[PDB]
Amino acid sequence: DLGKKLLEAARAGQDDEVRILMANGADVNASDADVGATPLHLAAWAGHLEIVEVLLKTGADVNAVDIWGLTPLHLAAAVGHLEIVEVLLKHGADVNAQDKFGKTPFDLAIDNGNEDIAEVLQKAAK
């Protein structure tokens, strides 16, 4: 299962393994069979900037959603990875995306005390 190996490599921050798996047939837009999460979701949550950048370069959907309605921007804003938030926004991440409960990335930044990210997102929503 090349797709699942790519998800796990992104989750684990294994940059070389991510690049090798894709060159070897793994789909940059692979998704988990049960919850729909993509490699970019996992890299944004786990905080691996270089993997985020290579997935985007290779064609990852910046606005992919999982079964809870979470986008990569939701995940990075929740954990508090400012540089990843900025990269995602630069690549067209939807600042107004609502999860299954109506929550935006800004809402998750607020809930997790990530005020610098919250300010970035508030200003991008202007």
Partner: peptide, 15 residues
Amino acid sequence: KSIRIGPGQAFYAXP
């Protein structure tokens, strides 16, 4: 486990 993310924590956590 400290990150307030909702039910999706089941898949992502981690912290």
